[PDB]
């Protein structure tokens, strides 16, 4: 059409309060890079699947969505095949994907998802409120399981009786080293500690039954909420309403750092399970393109950009630069040279290749790096940059001058000879045949013409 | 042909003693990335232009060369036009080039060079031997010019009479803020401190004549070599044979760090001129492709790779990893969050885009980063990764089970109800109609089939 296309994306959860500002900032970059704009509309947490499934079938046009019931819907033809789009529009994004993301999201030989590259493996963890651990001196060194959590819950119940000891909710189920390959509400798992060729009922796995017994003991003791089976209310990571909770953590979280940042306090973690790449971890955050989208190519271009352009993605995820965050350091690859490094055991940087991909030696200071950036930014061009002197009309005159120059120039230019004597001598020989003046005037004329852009 | 092509590059100067090792290491990468190999043959310093000009005209086949007399030879048709090759094979390399490199190397509307991205501007500098500055306590704070160098040369001549005070050679000429737009041995310059529209004779510029007078005074005093007008011998940066020398320095050198590294000692620098982008700085290190090359496309692919692949280029320029250098730090973009950052003023990383391009917050430790790398490397795949359960034969049985599950599961899974009572109750309802067993057996059969790859 006549305007740059606007691609509409549906997202799960509630909108940021500053969504207009975030999209303005993002769209500066998206418009510049791919000649389009992104509109993100949020559908809430509660009835996401319902809103996506039924209202889409008989209703509205869309380009991109956060997927619900991906595996089922992919088989029904709800989503545009991405197999060919990944070869061109999505080529950069595809290279960043762990092969498990491809295996996990392939349906009958085609791929229909853009997965967010992140916790391709993850583990279940207890997350502890560090403010309360410090206040009461409760040691968590022995905690490796629901069963071994008990002594620590006993301590917090005694010392701080109004804090919820283990803050869980109505979707809770005990975690183990299980693969639930199908997300359908049924009790069937592969026990990764048992026979991995067998489908088993979790309620018949002895250690899982033991966990349920433990949880029920916690219920009787008031260690978990009285209304756990019915409650919606979330526990704010920032507040001191809770002592321990269960969290999914993977390599993209960098240990306890992300939780501690979001909570703005010390959050300590102890793993309950091992990490593994499975359907659940590879399918958790999938974008799809509507099979009815009128902008399939541009939709992929935007997804490619969201997953490869750090200015764009950081602006959305950290929020507005200067209000939400600021830069404190830039990426630097450093080396130190060793005794093997000598003039004869390597090539020279100046005549081998782009010096800006060379690693930075240990003796370089941050000040020297910043000075180099400032100097590159401040440097101007000579007005004679790109000037070429055509010698066609003055061939023999240049040869005459150059021959005369070569007899004097080294003696004069090194200061071997006194210039007061040698320059007048040189100038007489250059001008004795008129070649000097001919070349000088031709050079000036062509330079005049160059500066006037003729 | 039948074999991966071997691209032959001619280079100026003398070969590294370990050239075979360097090319083996490089060619591992070049072969893998572009399906070709690079052969580099060195032609020496002395007669490079002669060897390149005449022996090429009537002699041998080649693909790539370090250019000599680029501007003249480009106009004669010696070099393959790169204008179109830069649009595909060289697209990444072209994006890394300062526009001055394009302007400086364009000849009659076409570009024939791959310039090394490096000191697009540079300045002339005095470089001092820091070992001698320290030993004798000679202060260089007042040195800004050839004239103001005199007192420091007087001091070293007195204190260390056998050291060469200002180590210059037969190609020396005093430097100034001049543009020599044509490299032809002639005396014509643009004075960047004067009228930049005029071509002038350097020997008539008053301050340049003054420099020659100064240099001649240095000659009479024994501050420069007695044989400067004839000598070939270089002064080794590593040795204490010299006190000051003149060096070209630009932003790619990071101040005095590169000189100090190559010398393996403190080298101090003082600039003589300003920095500017001109023909001399943009044309200094140009690779060309022979107009007679049988591998023009692959030649550009190799040049593109040399100028964009850090593993490749660092291997050649630093030399062999573990013998010549070792890694001490990897590139990291860091931020700190500010008071604006709250749950409602940004998007979530997990469902927005590739988390590996997100900047690293200040509270993340290097240990947490390394742990994340190790965990990503160690994580395995579930044997059920990619398993899809076809429900076609068990639709009503799944619905029956799922309905029964939804009546019990929250009470059991949260531990609200005692599992000793509730699990037997649940299991009776699931099996009362035989739907449980039907779904379990179908799931196991399809899983068996999946594991056998049917
Ligand atoms: Zn367990
Ligand atoms: Zn750094
Ligand atoms: Zn004299
Ligand atoms: Zn000067
Ligand atoms: Zn770093
Ligand atoms: Zn009970």
Numbering used by the authors:
A (entry chain A), B (entry chain A): 37 to 490
What does the report in the manuscript say about this coordinate set?
S. pneumoniae relies entirely on carbohydrates as a source of carbon and dedicates a third of all uptake systems to carbohydrate import. In the case of type I and II ABC importers a substrate-binding protein (SBP) presents the bound substrate to the outward-facing side of the transporter, which selectively binds the ligand and transfers it to the transmembrane domains. SBPs are formed by two α/β domains connected by a hinge region, which are interdependent in the apo form. Upon ligand binding at the interface between the two domains, the protein closes around the ligand in a more rigid conformation; ligand binding in this way has been termed the ‘Venus fly trap’ mechanism.
The structure of the carbohydrate-free substrate-binding protein SP0092 at 1.61 Å resolution reveals it to belong to the newly proposed subclass G of substrate-binding proteins, with a ligand-binding pocket that is large enough to accommodate complex oligosaccharides. SP0092 is a dimer in solution and the crystal structure reveals a domain-swapped dimer with the monomer subunits in a closed conformation but in the absence of carbohydrate ligand. This closed conformation may be induced by dimer formation and could be used as a mechanism to regulate carbohydrate uptake. SP009239–491 folds similarly to other substrate-binding proteins, presenting two globular α/β domains linked by a hinge region formed by three loops. The most striking feature of the oligomeric SP009239–491 structure is the presentation of a domain-swapped dimer structure. The hinge loop connecting the swapped and main domains is located at residues Gly366 and Lys367, which are positioned between the β15 and β16 strands. The members of subclass G are characterized by their larger molecular weight, additional structural elements, an enlarged ligand-binding cavity and a regulatory EF-hand-like calcium-binding site. SP009239–491 possesses all of the features characterizing this subfamily apart from the calcium-binding site and shows approximately 24% sequence identity to the other subclass G members. In the case of SP009239–491 the loop spanning residues 315–319 is reorganized to form an additional helix, α10. This helix is positioned in the central part of the ligand-binding cavity and may play a role in substrate interaction or recognition.
